[PDB]
Amino acid sequence: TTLTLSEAAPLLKKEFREGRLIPFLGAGFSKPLKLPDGSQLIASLAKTLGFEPELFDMHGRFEQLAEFFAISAPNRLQRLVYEMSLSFDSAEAEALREKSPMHRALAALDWRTIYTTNYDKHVEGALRDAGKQAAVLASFADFQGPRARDVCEVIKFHGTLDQPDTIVLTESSYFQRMALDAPPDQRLRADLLANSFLFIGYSFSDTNIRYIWYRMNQLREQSQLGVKHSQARRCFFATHGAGLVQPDILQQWNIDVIQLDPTDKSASVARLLESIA
Amino acid sequence: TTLTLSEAAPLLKKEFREGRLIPFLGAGFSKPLKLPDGSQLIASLAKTLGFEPELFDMHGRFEQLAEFFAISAPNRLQRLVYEMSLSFDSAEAEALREKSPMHRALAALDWRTIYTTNYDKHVEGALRDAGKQAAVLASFADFQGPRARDVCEVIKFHGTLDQPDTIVLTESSYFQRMALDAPPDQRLRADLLANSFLFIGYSFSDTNIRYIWYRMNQLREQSQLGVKHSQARRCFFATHGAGLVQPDILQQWNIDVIQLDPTDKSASVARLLESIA
Amino acid sequence: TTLTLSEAAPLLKKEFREGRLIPFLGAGFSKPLKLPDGSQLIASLAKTLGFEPELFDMHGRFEQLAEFFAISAPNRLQRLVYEMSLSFDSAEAEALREKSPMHRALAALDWRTIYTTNYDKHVEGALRDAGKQAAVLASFADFQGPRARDVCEVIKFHGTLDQPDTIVLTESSYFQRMALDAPPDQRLRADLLANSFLFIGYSFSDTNIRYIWYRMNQLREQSQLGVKHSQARRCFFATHGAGLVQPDILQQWNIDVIQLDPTDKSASVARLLESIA
Amino acid sequence: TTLTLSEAAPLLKKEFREGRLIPFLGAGFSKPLKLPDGSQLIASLAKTLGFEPELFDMHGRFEQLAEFFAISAPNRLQRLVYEMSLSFDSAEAEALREKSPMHRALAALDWRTIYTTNYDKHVEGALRDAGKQAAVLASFADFQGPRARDVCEVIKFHGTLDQPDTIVLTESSYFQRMALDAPPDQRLRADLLANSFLFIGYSFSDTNIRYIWYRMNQLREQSQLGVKHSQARRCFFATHGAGLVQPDILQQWNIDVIQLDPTDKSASVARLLESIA
Amino acid sequence: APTWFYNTTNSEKLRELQHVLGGSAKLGYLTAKVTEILDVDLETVIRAKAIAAYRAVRVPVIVEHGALCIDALNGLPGALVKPFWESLDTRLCEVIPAGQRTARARGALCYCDGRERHVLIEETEGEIAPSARGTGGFHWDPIFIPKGQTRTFAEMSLDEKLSFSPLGRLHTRLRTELGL
Amino acid sequence: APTWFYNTTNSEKLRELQHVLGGSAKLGYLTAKVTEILDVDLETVIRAKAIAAYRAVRVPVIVEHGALCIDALNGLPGALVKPFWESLDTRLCEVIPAGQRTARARGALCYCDGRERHVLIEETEGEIAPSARGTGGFHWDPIFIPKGQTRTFAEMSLDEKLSFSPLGRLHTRLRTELGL
Ligand SMILES: O=c1nc[nH]c2c1ncn2[C@H]1C[C@H](O)[C@@H](COP(=O)(O)OP(=O)(O)OP(=O)(O)O)O1
Ligand SMILES: O=c1nc[nH]c2c1ncn2[C@H]1C[C@H](O)[C@@H](COP(=O)(O)OP(=O)(O)OP(=O)(O)O)O1
Ligand SMILES: NC(=O)c1cccnc1
Ligand SMILES: NC(=O)c1cccnc1
Ligand SMILES: NC(=O)c1cccnc1
Ligand SMILES: NC(=O)c1cccnc1
Ligand SMILES: [Zn+2]
Ligand SMILES: [Zn+2]
C-alpha cells in the first residue's frame, strides 16, 4: 500500500528523463539547517506575546495563532519578517548548507522548476553552490522580469523574505489564496496539468495546497477517463512518518506515498535524490 | 472586551424589532437532546473502523477522519446517514425537545429566517411544537418549491437527513462548498449583506463559514467607509467558553462575543433568547 | 388438497437436514412488530398527498400508487425511506423482536440463506439476538464484499433501508426488475435450481416473484422429465388465509400450501418453525 | 393537465397527414356491439365453475381467474374460444357493426396499421364494410404470408378467434409475452420507435403493454436528449373516465390524455375520429 | 363538456336540481344505482354513498341523501327514510302520537372529486301532518309541514317548496364551492 | 384445527352458539366487524353480509343477522332492528298500538365457503309485550313474547329461550349441512 525507496526509484527515473518531474519542498527540507518548523515559530510568537508556549498552542491552529500575532500591535508582522531574515538566512545557516547531503543531491540534478513553501534562500542557494544558476519567482514583477534562457525557476509558493508582501503566514493571507488567483497559484495549476510532483519534507497541512489537488480531480473525473487512464499520471509523497489516514486520502488525488527510513531523516532523503540520477 | 448578557440584550432587541436579526444554530444547540457533537461522531466512526477512539483522533482533523470513513468500503456513508437518522431524530429526542427551555424560547420569537449546521429536525421541530409552521430549505428543489406566504424559513446550511445528498461531512464535501455556489451558500451571502446574525451553540471551526465572513470584509474594506460607519452593523457570538485568540480574530469581521455563564449552559442560552422578547 | 402442520413437518425436516431448505419471508412476518403491511403504507402515502385513504386506494394497484407518490414532488421518495427507517427500525420495534416467538424460532435453526422482501433489520436482527451472526446482501457491492466463512447470508430481495437505491417500491422499480438482472434476482434463480423454499408471511402478489417461478417451469417442462420426477422437488407456502384460486395456480409451479391455524397467526408460525428442529 | 377534443384535434391531423398515427383499440371499442368486456367474461367463467360471480372476483386478478378456469378440466380453454367465437362474431353483432358510428368513422380514414387487443373480427370487419380491404396479422405464418401491396394491416395483438393458439387470456400466456419475443410484440416495438399511437377504448391494465412503454423510455432517457426534444413525439389516450393517478403515470411515457364526454360514450369517440379527417 | 356530475336514480330529484342548477353548463347528470349502508346518521350514509358512486362512474360526482328524524320515534328513521315510505305510506301519520308531531327534515349533498369528500348539510324544522294532504312533489311531501307554514311540501309549488326545503339552501352552497 | 368460522362482534350471540354448537371441534370463532346494507329484507342483508365478511377474514365463514318484522309497522324494522333498539329502547313497546301487537322474530344464518352462499332462515311468531319485563338475554329480549307462551325471551333461561328462538332450529340445520 506504500512504495519503498527501491520500488519508487525506477518510477522517478522515467519521469525525470522525460522532463516531467518537479520537486515540491517543505519546511522539513530546511530542518538540517537548524531552522524552526511550523511549531518552533509558534513557540517564538508566544514568547513575544507573553504566553507560555504550551498554553498558546491550544487556542487555535497554526494559521490562526499567526493571525492573532499580526494584529496584536501595529508593525508586528514586519518585525517578524525582519527577525526571520536574521535567523533563517544567517551565515551559519549558509555554512551548514554546503555540507548538507540533501542540498547537494538536489542541486546535482538538472531540474527546470522547483516549488517551495518555505521562506529561505536555501533551495536556490543550493543551486548557486553547485555552480548552477537559479531564478526566484515569487511576485507578479518576478514573472514578468527578465531571466536567462534555460535556468531553473524556483517558485517561492508562499513568498520570500526579501519581498515581505508575498509572505502568506496569517489566516487572512491563506484565505486570500483560496481564490487561486495569485501568480504562484496560477503557475502551479498549469504545471499540475502536465507533470508529476515529488513532495519532499512537506506534510499536507495547508488547506490551499489540498484544495488545488482537489480541483484537479474535478477535471479528472469530469473528463470521464477509464480506470486505467485516469490512474496513469501519479504524484509522489516522500515521508518518514505518514499516519494511517492521510495516505488513503491522497490516493484519491493520484498521490503515492514513498516510505523513507525514519532512523536518519537526512540520509534517507539524500538516497532518494541520488537514485533519480 | 466582551459583552455580557445584560449589555447585549438592548442591542439584540433593536435588531429584532427591525426584523434584521437571524439566528445561526450549531451543534451545541442540540446538546441537551443527548445528541453527539463533532467528537462523539468520531468516537462512533472509530468503533466501526476498528480504531481505538483516542488513536483515531490523532491522524487528522474532523473533516479528514470522515473522509477516511466514507472511502473505507462502498456504501459506508449511506449507512452513517441511516444510523444518524435513527439516533438524532428518535422519539426520545423528540420528547426531550418539548421540555427543553432553549427550544421553547427560540420558538416563542417570531423569526423569519433561521440557519443551522446540524442534521436534525429539532429546530423546525421546535417551531411545530409552538404551533408555528416552518419551511425547511436544504437543496435546489426546496428553494424553488412551493411555500406559504409568511413562514419562517429554516435553512439547513449543511444538509438534512431526509436528503442524504445534501449532507456535507467529509473533506471532499467541504472543498465542494468552497466555491460558495451551493443554494445555502448563495442565500447566506445575500442575508449577510443586510442582517445581523446571532451565533448560538456554534464554534467557528468550519473553514467555509470563516471564509464567508472573510469575503464580506473584502467588500467592506474596498467600499472605503469610515471608522465609524464600517463598524456599525455587528454580528453576535454567544459562547460559554471562547478562548483568548478567537474573540480577537472575529473582531476583524464585526463579530462581537457574548459571554454566557458556563455553570449551566442550557439556562444561560434560554435567558438570552428570552431577553430578545 | 392442502397440507396441514403435522403432515408438512416430516417433509420439512428432510429438506432441512440435507441443507436444501431456504426460508422466504414476507411482510406478514413483521406484523407482530406493529409495522405497516402493504396497506398501511398506502394509508400513510394518502395522508401526505391529501387523499382520503379509501379514495386513494381505488385509483390503482400498490405499485402504481407508490409510483404516483414518488413523482408528486422532488425528493419525495427519499423522505419516505427516511420516515420508514425511523418507524420500521425503531427501538420499540427492537424490543418487541426479542420477545417475539417467531423470530426466536427462526434464529434457533442453523440456516445458510434467508430471503426477505421487507425493508427492516428484523430478520438479520433476530439472528444477532440469538448470538449468531448474519450477512446482509442487498446490492452488488455487498456480494463482492468480504464475509466470514460459514455465516447465514440474508438476501434482502427488495432492498434495505440503509441503502436507499436498492429499495423497489414504485412501479418503475418493479419493471426494472423484470429483466431478472439484479444481483438478488440472479442469486434467487440459481438457488431455486437446487433448493426447496418455505414461504412464511408472504402472499404472491409481486409479479416479479411469480415470473421467476413461471420461468423455472419452462426449464422443467422443456427438460421432458416424467410425471414422477418433475413433481419431486416441491416448495412450501405457509398461509393462514389462502383463497380458492391461488393454491391451484401454484400447484403448476410445484408449490404446496401449508394451512396454518388462523385464530392465532403468530403461534401457528412458531409451531411450524419449531417442528423443523 | 388534460387535452380536450378541440385541443387534440389539430395535433391528430398533423400526425395523420404525415402517416405517423396508428390506432390502438381496446375492449371498450366493441362495447356498442353488446359484447362482454373483461368483467362479463369472468361472470361467465364463474357460472361454469359453480361460483357466484361476486365471490369469484375476489380471489385474484383477471389474468389469474382465467388461469384457474383453464386448468379446471381438460379442454376447458378450447371450449371457451368456441363459445366466444359464437357470441363475439355472431350475425347480430355483424348487424350492429354497420350502423355503429365509431366503426364507420374508423374505416373512413385511410390507415396503414391498426393494433387491437380484442378477439373479434369487428375492426377488420369495419374496413370490409366500407369497401376497403384489410390484412389480419396474428401469428408468425400471417407475417410471412402473402398480402397485397397497400392494404391496412390489422395487428391482432392478443390473438384471433380463428387461430386459438394465439389467444393470450390466462396468466401463463401473459408471462410468455413478457419476453417480448412474439411476432406482435416485435412489430409493436418497432412501430413505437417512429409513430404516435391513439388509444381508443383501451385502459392500461395489461402489464405487458405498460412494460413496452416502460422500455421505450429506457431508450429515450439513455439517448440523453434535451428537455425539449425528448418530449416531442407524444402518444394519445382517449378515455372518458381516467382517474387521478393513471394520467400522471403515463406522462412519464409521453402519453397525453384526451378527455372525452362521458354522457354518451359512442358519440364522443365518433366525433374524435371525424375530427382527424 | 361538464366537469361535475350529479348522480341520482330518482327522476323527481333530477327535475328539482335542474330547476335551479339547470342553466349551469358545468354540471352533468348520471343515473348510477348505489347501495347505502345501514346507519341512522345522515353524515355517515352520505359520506359512504359518494365513495360508492365515484367507484361506479369514475368522474367527479355529487350525490344526495336525506333524513326525516322524528322526535316521537327518537330520531327514527333518520337516514333510513327510504324503506319507511315504502312500508308505511300514510300510516306514518298514524303511528306517531298526536301532540308530539315535531320532526326535522335533513338533507345532505356530498361531492367527491376522487381525492376528497365534502359534505354540505341543511335542515328544516317542522312537524308531521295529522293526515296526508297535497298532490305535488314526491315521497313524504304530503306529510311534512314546515315550521311557521300551515301547508305541506306537496301543497306548495316547486318555487315555494324550495324556499323551505333543505335543497333551496344547498343550491347556493354547491354553486359557490364548485363555481357552477 | 377448525374448518368453519362463526364471525360475530356481539359477545352475547357468541355464548348462545357456543352453548349448543360449542363442543364441535370443526367450528372456530372470529370477531370481524362488517357493515350491513340498507334493506328491510332479511334474505338480502344476510346474503350481502357473508360476502362482506368473507372479504375480511378469507376463510369459510358463517354470519348471522336477524329481523323483528311487526304487523303494526307493516314489517318495520325488518332487518333494520339494530338501530331501533339503539334509538327506541323500551319506548318501542309504546309506539305500537295496544290490540295489534303481533310480530315475527326472524333469524338467518348464511355460510360462505368462498364460492357459494347458502342461507338458512327460521322464524318465530309472537307479539310485542305491553312493557319490557325480564333480565336475562340481551337486545329486545324483554319485549318479545312467543306465541302460546306468556313469558318473554328475557324471562326464560338459555335452554328455554333456544326452545322457542329461531337459533334453536338453526343449530340442527347448520350441523347437518356442514357436518359439525
Ligand atoms: O327533498 C325531498 N322531498 C321529498 N321526498 C324526498 C326528498 N329527499 C328524499 N326524498 C325521498 C325520496 C326517497 O324515497 C327517500 C330518499 O332515499 P334515496 O336513497 O335518496 O332515493 P333513491 O335511491 O331513489 O335516489 P338516489 O339514487 O339519488 O339515492 O326519501
Ligand atoms: O336472537 C336474538 N335474541 C336477542 N337479541 C338479538 C337476537 N338477534 C339479534 N339481536 C339483536 C342484537 C343486535 O342488537 C340486533 C341485530 O343486529 P346485528 O348486526 O346482528 O348485531 P351486531 O352487529 O352487534 O353483531 P354481528 O357482528 O354478529 O352482526 O338485534
Ligand atoms: N524558511 C523555513 O524554514 C520555514 C519554517 C517554517 C515556516 N516557513 C518557513
Ligand atoms: N444533528 C446534530 O446535532 C449534529 C451534531 C454534530 C454534527 N452534526 C450534526
Ligand atoms: N419492513 C416492512 O415491514 C415492510 C412493510 C411493507 C412493505 N415493505 C416492507
Ligand atoms: N372481442 C372482445 O370484444 C373482447 C372483450 C373482452 C376481452 N377480450 C376480447
Ligand atoms: Zn338510494
Ligand atoms: Zn352488525
**Three-class secondary structure assignment of B136-190:** EECCHHHHCCCCCCCCEEEEECCCECCEHHHCCCCHHHHHHCCCCCCHHHHHHHH
Residues within a 6 A CB radius of ligand 5: C 27, 30, 35-38, 41, 88, 118-120
Ligand 1 atom nearest residue E141's Cα:
4
Strands ordered across the beta sheet of D235-239: D134-137, D152-156, D113-116, D21-25, D196-200, D235-239, D255-259
Q: How far apart are CA B48 and CA B51, in angstroms?
A: 8
The three state secondary structure string of chain C is CCECHHHHHHHHHHHHHCCCEEEEECHHHHHHHCCCCHHHHHHHHHHHHCCCHHHHHHHCCHHHHHHHHHCCCCCHHHHHHHHHHHHHCCHHHHHHHHCCHHHHHHHCCCCCEEEECCCCCCCHHHHHHCCCCEEEECCHHHHCCCCCCCCEEEEECCCECCEHHHCCCCHHHHHHCCCCCCHHHHHHHHHCCCCEEEEECCCCCCCCHHHHHHHHHHHHHHCCCCCCCCCCCCEEEEECCCCCCHHHHHHHHCEEEEECCCCCHHHHHHHHHHHHC
Q: Which residues pair with C134 in a beta bridge?
A: C152
Closest Cβ opposite residue C51 in set E54, E55, E115? E115
Q: Which ligand is nearest to the CA of E35?
A: 7
Q: Which of B162, B163, B165, B166 to mutate to test the interface with C (most CBs of C within 10 A)?
A: B162
Ligand 1 contact, E85 CB (< 6 A): yes
Strands ordered across the beta sheet of F102-112: F27-30, F4-7, F61-67, F102-112, F117-128, F144-146
* Amino acid at the residue E58: R
| B178 contacts chain A (CB < 8 A) | yes
Residues E116, C51: C-beta atoms closer than 8 Å: yes
Q: Show the CA angle centred on residue B163, arms to residues B159 and B167, nearest 5°.
A: 35
Ligand 1 atom nearest residue E167's Cα:
1
Helix axes B62-70, B76-88, angle to 10 degrees: 120
Q: Which residues pair with C113 in a beta bridge?
A: C153
Q: Which of C42, C55, C58 to mutate to test the interface with E (most CBs of E within 10 A)?
A: C55
Q: How far is B78 from chain C (nearest CA, A)?
A: 6
Q: How far apart are CA A274 and CA A261, in angstroms?
A: 15
Q: How far apart are CA E170 and CA E168, in angstroms?
A: 5
Please, what sign has the CA dihedral across residues D192, D196, D199, D203?
Answer: positive
Q: How far apart are CA E125 and CA E144, in angstroms?
A: 10
3-state secondary structure of E162: coil
Grid cell 480504531 is found at: B51
Subunits in contact with chain C (3 or more CB pairs closer than 8 Å)? B, D, E, F
For A120, the grid coordinates are 529561505
Q: How far apart are CA B60 and CA B39, in angstroms?
A: 13
For F142, the grid coordinates are 324483554
Residue whose Cα lies nearest atom 4 of ligand 3: it is: A118
CB E113: neighbour CB atoms within 10 A?
18
In sequence order, what DSSP letters do the residues of A101-143 get, joined into one string?
Answer: HHHHHHHTS--SEEEE-SSSSSSHHHHHHTT--EEEE-SHHHH
Touch test B–F: 3 Cβ pairs or more under 8 Å? no
Cβ contact F84:E76 at 8 Å? yes
Closest Cβ opposite residue E117 in set C50, C52, C58? C52
Q: Show the CA angle centred on residue A29, arms to residues A27 and A34, nearest 5°.
A: 80
* Amino acid at the residue C167: I
Cβ contact F26:F47 at 8 Å? no
CB C267: neighbour CB atoms within 10 A?
13
Ligand 4 contact, B205 CB (< 6 A): no
| E116 contacts chain D (CB < 8 A) | no
- CB < 8 Å to E58, chain D: 241-243
Q: Which residues pair with F102 in a beta bridge?
A: F127
Q: How far is the CA of B106 from the centre of ligand 4 (A)?
A: 18
Q: Please provide residue C229's backbone torsions phi and psi, each rounded to the nearest 5 degrees.
A: -85, -25
Cβ contact B22:B111 at 8 Å? yes
Q: How far apart are CA C25 and CA C20, in angstroms?
A: 16
Question: What single DSSP character describes residue D260?
Answer: P
For B204, nearest residue in chain A (alpha carbons): A60
Ligand 1 contact, E66 CB (< 6 A): yes
CB A219: neighbour CB atoms within 10 A?
11
Q: How far apart are CA B124 and CA B115, in angstroms?
A: 10
Give the residue from E170, E103, E107 showing the smallest Cα distance to E143: E103
Grid cell 495547508 is found at: A206
Q: Which experimental method was this entry solved with?
A: cryo-EM
Give the residue from A40, A38, A48 showing the smallest Cα distance to A79: A48
Cβ contact F180:F4 at 8 Å? yes
Q: How far apart are CA E50 and CA E119, in angstroms?
A: 10
Question: What single DSSP character describes residue A160?
Answer: B
| A245 contacts chain B (CB < 8 A) | yes
Q: How far is C254 from chain D (nearest CA, A)?
A: 15
Give the residue from C94, C78, C79, C74 showing the smallest Cα distance to C34: C94
Residue whose Cα lies nearest atom 4 of ligand 5: it is: C118
Q: Please provide residue C82's backbone torsions phi and psi, each rounded to the nearest 5 degrees.
A: -60, -45
3-state secondary structure of B99: coil
Residue whose Cα lies nearest atom 5 of ligand 5: it is: C37
Q: What is the resolution of this structure in A?
A: 2.6
Ligand 1 atom nearest residue E33's Cα:
27
For F158, the grid coordinates are 338459555
Give the residue from E167, E161, E159, E146 showing the smallest Cα distance to E64: E167
For A185, the grid coordinates are 497559484
Closest Cβ opposite residue C58 in set E55, E116, E117? E55
Q: How far apart are CA A56 and CA A72, in angstroms?
A: 14
Cis peptide before E60 (omega within 30 of 0): no
Q: How far apart are CA F24 and CA D65, in angstroms?
A: 34
For C241, nearest residue in chain F (alpha carbons): F58
Subunits in contact with chain F (3 or more CB pairs closer than 8 Å)? C, D, E
Please, what sign has the CA dihedral across residues C128, C132, C137, C141?
Answer: positive
- CB < 8 Å to C73, chain B: 141, 145
Grid cell 551559519 is found at: A92
Q: Which residues pair with A24 in a beta bridge?
A: A115, A199
**Strand intervals (E) in chain B:** 21-25, 113-116, 134-137, 152-156, 196-200, 235-239, 255-259
Element (H, E) at A22: strand A21-25
Hey, which of C30, C83, C96, C115 would you mutate to test ligand 5's pocket, going by the most ligand atoms within 8 Å of its Cβ? Answer: C30
Ligand 3 contact, A202 CB (< 6 A): no
In sequence order, what DSSP letters do the residues of A26-69 get, joined into one string?
Answer: -GGGGGGGT---HHHHHHHHHHHHT--HHHHGGGS-HHHHHHHH
Residues F54, D55: C-beta atoms closer than 8 Å: yes
How many angstroms separate the first and last alpha carbons of chain F? 13
Helix axes C209-222, C183-191, angle to 10 degrees: 40
Q: How far is C58 from chain E (nearest CA, A)?
A: 7
Give the residue from F127, F130, F149 showing the smallest Cα distance to F69: F127
Ligand 6 contact, D53 CB (< 6 A): no
Cβ contact D243:C60 at 8 Å? yes
Q: Please provide residue A234's backbone torsions phi and psi, each rounded to the nearest 5 degrees.
A: -105, 160
Give the residue from C198, C192, C261, C195 showing the smallest Cα distance to C12: C198
* Amino acid at the residue C109: L
Ligand 6 contact, D118 CB (< 6 A): yes
For B26, the grid coordinates are 450549531
Q: How far is the CA of B36 from the centre of ligand 4 (A)?
A: 6
For E43, the grid coordinates are 353524515
